[PDB]
Design a protein around this ligand. Structure first.
Ligand SMILES: [Cl-]
Ligand SMILES: [Cl-]
Ligand SMILES: [Zn+2]
Ligand SMILES: [Zn+2]
Ligand SMILES: [Zn+2]
Ligand SMILES: [Zn+2]
Ligand SMILES: [Zn+2]
Ligand SMILES: [Zn+2]
Lengths: 776, 778
């Protein structure tokens, strides 16, 4: 172990949790950014599995009778493992074909169906050139996955082809149904020829959103929806049942909440008779989880049915973990298998989490268990209630923008989850303080830093509302670390919807404290300009009186042809508080330098004609030399190399630059033999990044990453030698998701570390050896 | 050039002997300390600078030659020194070698006629350090050549009697007239000092000893104080003040208006009183009453028309800056008018005892404005006793006996004698000790040990702190200050000890208190002549204290047993990674390095592991690169290790089972040749290679300091580096540290740089940057 994770567990949208039918307590989890995790203790702890070509996983299936053979459906196609998920290989027939369901023929594990699909991730189906519209197809293997046949069930190239489920008749293994936006289809020869099943009301709601079939094969359950381009605005899915011997649908929503996106129904494999247990959650909607009971008679008539919430709002009966997400959005839900020694239970989620319910057949009760985070003995106070801090169970799937550390305190600023805070060095966390009174949540935190309020170390943060990275505005908050404990509180200083302190509403893509005067804080409001808090102690003095001290505007950026309009990273000068650098990503791009004059006025100018949306600049001092380091595209004549991002270095504050790292350097230090995905999607890979470069003392770090495909090439550490040259080494090591949004060199407990945040796998740190620092 | 050793002190803090104005240059003054030699200032005390190296640093007198401000005489316990470069360097006068001198006086009109008088002020407990005795013949060294040679003039033949001379004063109106004031009595010469004979005092039956004389500038009136002939000043408290004309010996007591029963001494006439009205300045030794100025109006027939005494300095009332040393009323143990030459204005130089103070004079008012000339107030305040007191940074002198130091972030504490808890919140620049004054006459003036503990995650100062002056600590008390804010708002609370044995901790002084590095909530302490005790968790002890309750300490070792037990600890060294193991250096009962090991049942077994000895012997235990080091600074050690009374550095890497010599006096003399010591040729034959402590170990670094407290001689500070083959290579790091004897040293990282913090038995706290140090990450 080299890279050390510091996360509270999970935190990203979970696609599925799949049980191994051959052995109780063995489960796999499909993440949308880090691939597949495995557990052999029913989710008490999770371990990463082998490397996939694409990490956006929609389906995992374990071969009945062979736990070593596992199939994984990803956005780029099907993978097969023959060593129990230790290693994976892309299946050539399905390359560039997103797969989201995998089903085995009952009694013949060599007969497999893998169906094109992508769950609700319509936003991502085009990342590799696919479209939602196309012929309706499935892939069928009859030799256990060595070869696959392409079967067409609909030939309309202009209609949505997403398949949501494939389900076999347990009582007649050659009968199989599929549920698709194309409709529900049936095959009586194992999936080689299909016929369409008419829906309950195809003129109005033709799209199927999942089917279920009773084990005796006699009853089909389905939900149906109107045709609309985006699930965001398609809210009412209705639930129906029909006998399969004569298609005649009846609506069976009596007892369900109205106007919900019910999907992926599923019959308990234990329902072998005329009473069927049907598990029903939904995409997006938060209502917990339903179990329905349908009592048919032997005439094929439904005597009665009833839906029961077996999971509901937070009420004290289950540990919600750190992710206070109530009611649960049960975006997947499965009964446990009847094989392998499994007990009867339910696997589900609150959306970003993993939950397992055990079942009491005496009183038909469910007991929900947190399978993503572990509470510690530390407590935080919020809503007048005490909540534990939580340490991860082995997974981490958060989009983390930035990180700051002071003594025992760590904060990572995340998308979706906002202010993620730790008071034990990053072992356990809580983000409860981001849920503010008045009904708004500080769910997007793009920058954090540590300032100085009259000698008291004070966290500063760009913290605003908005999910999925859709930050609403620039908004500056501060937390005085009086106790380095959960008792410390956040207060708002500037920005927000109310334009507090005269700070405009443009997002502060970075907030930076001056190392020379840590009371002074710089921030760049997107499309407005660069602003400054001269002394944060004075700003808090006004705040404590119920007043507000205005911020100072030091640069105006409102002209696209002449001004820098957006900044990604601000680098104050390490020793001169009247000089700052920033990387401009809007208007006139590149590294900009500003200098304050005696009358307090500033002059700004471009010092490197670079570009790139996530371009960074860093300035530090080491043994008498001030280094200026740019990670970006371009640079001008003699430096630009197409759209390749490069590391450029200057020792004279940006008047002269030297190219010290390129993609060719990266490939020589870390050959493409190290990348499982090079042969298949290397022709698409672009040498860019999400950020994550840093410099301190004699060390420099960077990471090549292409967010278009969630592909990370590697992490590279450079050592500045006594003569000026930089020698580079590969420090990727065991970091499996290596793209980086930010990196900082941080000394903790007398040892120098590299703290790095990732756009999908949270926070990691790594020991750095042989480092020299200036005494500071 | 530049500086290496960096002082961190509030200013002065030790008994001040004198402040002498340069008559040739206004605002030029010299200060006589008893352990730092002579300080100089050219801005009338706004800032002080060190001067040249003396052979002995107990200075009793300083005099600048009239007409040549570059020739300066300095009287010390070992004799007169002479500088010809304005105090930059000194040479010891050979005729006065081993002769304590406390008075130097020049002849008016001819500065080549000088008188140097044997003396030692009130330092009767120090006159014997180099073999001298208080009893002896009354004698005086006189020179007619400006200092080339000195002849010994005897004015009393009795060797049964005390010969201390207090003052020597010429007659400004006829330069060959001069008097001296001595425990012999008042003697007068019309010779310029070649023959003398005794003047009868006012009542030699009861009070034969004169404690200083003063002569009016016209030579016509003499003032004096006379004392009983009792040696110990603690039981001789009633000095009486008299006046006589010099035409007829006819003493008149002139105490009316003075406080009764005071040790009045060193009277002085304002050189401006050239007529028949005299202003007389009068302070005292020990007694605290401020400072008197007396006015004597004589008429030409020769009688005292009238006289009155007025307090020109008094109890603190807010009208003068008392500085950090809340010492009120002032004990004006010296007081001098400013000269009339050199452009000086009229003023008074004096002290509250450990300080330096200057008063300016308003003539159209007869008011004095007292100015703090030892420390500088900052803008930080300490709230105490309904008043907000500034913190104070030093003006260039430091004279405190400091036992120990502890640092956490911006907070620094010096544990001192006399001045108790000396605390800083800006890294040691400025200080306050006001919190040691607890009220009701209960002052924590002696703090022999400090450390930083951990109370539920909050760093917490722990201290042995008790009443008593001059190092006479009354008992052991454990105090704790939680550093909630690292600011003067943090407060001390007493956890255990005292005369009522709070928490079951007995009354013996906790000569050391040490926190376990493996578990910083656990604190060890050794109560002198009782044993070793433990606070298992200081947070839990504070939980009880905050409820108005007390959690008992734990006894882990009885030290009641003279022939079997260790009974006094000088330093406790808890094991760096195993909280069940503790070492300490025993300096009472069975001496040496002892090791205690906690067993399964919770009991402890202790045993001696080195047969060392020494009152200030130290032990240090630390870890570096997989080795646990145990280092002793002491004499002895047993067969193969003992070498007479020489202190040595012994090292062990197996918890004291086997030891090796790694530094000896021979190694020190090779690394730092005696060529570096100005005192070697005079008193080097007396120097013993001992120490007051100040050894330390951390990472690949070991430090020690050779120092003989019997003569206040420091040989040097030595730093050893642990090579990868296990051997230690030593270097001299004395550099500009002029007082280099040490009571404690700690290696401390501050803002990314390793520093050595060392406290000294007389010059406060100093720190030095340490290069090439490597630590285990922790
Ligand atoms: Cl219904
Ligand atoms: Cl001493
Ligand atoms: Zn998704
Ligand atoms: Zn940032
Ligand atoms: Zn004295
Ligand atoms: Zn100590
Ligand atoms: Zn308690
Ligand atoms: Zn005993």
């Amino acid at each position: 172990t080299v890279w050390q994770p510091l996360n509270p567990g999970a935190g990203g949208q979970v696609q599925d949790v799949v049980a191994d039918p051959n052995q109780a307590n063995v489960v796999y989890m499909a993440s949308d950014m880090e691939g597949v995790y495995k557990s052999t203790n029913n989710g008490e702890s999770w371990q990463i599995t082998g490397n996939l070509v694409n990490n956006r996983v929609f389906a995992v299936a374990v071969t009945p009778g062979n736990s070593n053979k596992i199939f994984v459906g990803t956005l780029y196609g099907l993978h097969i493992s023959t060593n129990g998920s230790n290693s994976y290989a892309l299946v050539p027939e399905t390359e560039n074909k997103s797969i989201a369901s995998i089903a085995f023929k009952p009694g013949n594990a060599n007969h497999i169906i893998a169906a094109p699909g992508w769950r609700d991730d319509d936003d991502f189906i085009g990342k590799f050139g696919e479209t939602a519209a196309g012929p309706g197809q499935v892939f069928v293997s009859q030799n256990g996955g060595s070869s696959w046949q392409t079967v067409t069930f609909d030939s309309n190239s202009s209609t949505d082809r997403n398949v949501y489920s494939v389900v076999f008749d347990q009582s007649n293994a050659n009968t199989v149904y599929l549920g698709s936006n194309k409709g529900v289809y049936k095959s009586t020869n194992g999936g080689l020829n299909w016929q369409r099943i008419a829906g309950p009301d195809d003129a109005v709601r033709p799209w199927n959103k999942g089917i279920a079939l009773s084990p005796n094969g006699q009853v089909l359950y389905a939900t149906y929806a109107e045709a609309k381009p985006d699930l965001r605005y398609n809210t009412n899915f209705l639930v129906y049942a029909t006998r399969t011997s004569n298609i005649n649908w009846q609506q069976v929503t009596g007892g369900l909440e109205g106007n919900r996106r019910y999907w992926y129904p599923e019959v308990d494999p234990r329902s072998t008779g005329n009473s069927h247990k049907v598990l029903l959650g939904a995409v997006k909607d938060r209502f917990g989880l339903y179990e329905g009971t349908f009592n048919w008679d032997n005439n094929g008539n439904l005597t009665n049915f009833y839906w029961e919430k077996i999971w509901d709002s937070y009420d004290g009966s289950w540990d919600i973990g750190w992710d206070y997400a109530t009611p649960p959005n049960a975006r997947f839900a499965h009964y446990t298998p009847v094989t392998g020694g499994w007990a009867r239970g339910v696997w589900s989620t609150t959306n970003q989490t993993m939950y397992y319910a055990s079942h009491n057949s005496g009183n038909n009760s469910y007991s929900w268990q947190n399978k993503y985070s572990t509470p510690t003995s530390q407590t935080v106070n919020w809503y007048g209630t005490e909540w534990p801090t939580y340490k991860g169970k082995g997974t981490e799937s958060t989009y983390t923008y930035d990180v700051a550390v002071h003594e025992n305190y760590v904060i990572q600023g995340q998308a979706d989850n906002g202010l993620m805070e730790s008071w034990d060095g990053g072992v356990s966390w809580s983000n409860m303080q981001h849920r503010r009174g008045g009904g708004f949540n500080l769910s997007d935190v793009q920058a954090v830093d540590i300032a100085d309020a009259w000698g008291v170390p004070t966290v500063v943060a760009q913290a605003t509302s908005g999910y999925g990275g859709g930050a609403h505005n620039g908004r500056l908050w501060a937390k005085r670390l009086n106790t380095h404990s959960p008792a410390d509180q956040w207060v708002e200083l500037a920005g927000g919807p109310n334009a507090k302190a005269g700070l405009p509403k443009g997002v502060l893509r970075d907030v930076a404290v001056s190392p020379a005067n840590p009371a002074k804080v710089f921030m760049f409001s997107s499309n407005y300009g660069m602003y400054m808090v001269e002394d944060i102690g004075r700003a808090l003095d006004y705040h404590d009186r119920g007043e507000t001290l205005p911020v100072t505007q030091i640069y105006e950026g409102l002209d696209n042809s002449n001004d820098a309009r957006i900044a990604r990273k601000i680098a104050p000068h390490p020793t001169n508080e009247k000089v700052v650098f920033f990387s401009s990503t809007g208007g006139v791009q590149g590294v900009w330098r500003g200098e304050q004059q005696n009358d307090g006025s500033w002059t700004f100018a471009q010092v490197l004609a670079s570009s790139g949306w996530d371009a960074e600049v860093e300035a530090w001092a080491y043994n008498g030399t001030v280094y200026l380091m740019s990670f970006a595209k371009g640079g001008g004549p003699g430096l630009t190399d197409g759209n390749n991002w490069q590391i450029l270095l200057s020792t004279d504050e940006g008047q002269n630059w030297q190219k010290i790292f390129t993609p060719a350097d990266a490939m020589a230090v870390r050959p493409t033999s190290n990348l499982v995905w090079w042969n298949s999607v290397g022709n698409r890979f672009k040498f860019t990044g999400k950020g994550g470069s840093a410099g301190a003392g004699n060390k420099i770090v960077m990471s090549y990453y292409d967010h278009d495909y969630q592909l990370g090439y590697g992490v590279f550490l450079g050592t500045i030698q006594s003569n000026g040259q930089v020698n580079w080494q590969d420090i990727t090591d065991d970091l499996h998701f290596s793209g980086m949004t930010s990196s900082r060199f941080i000394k903790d407990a007398g040892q120098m570390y590299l703290y790095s945040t990732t756009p999908g796998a949270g926070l990691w740190r790594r020991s750095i050896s042989g480092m020299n620092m200036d005494p500071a």
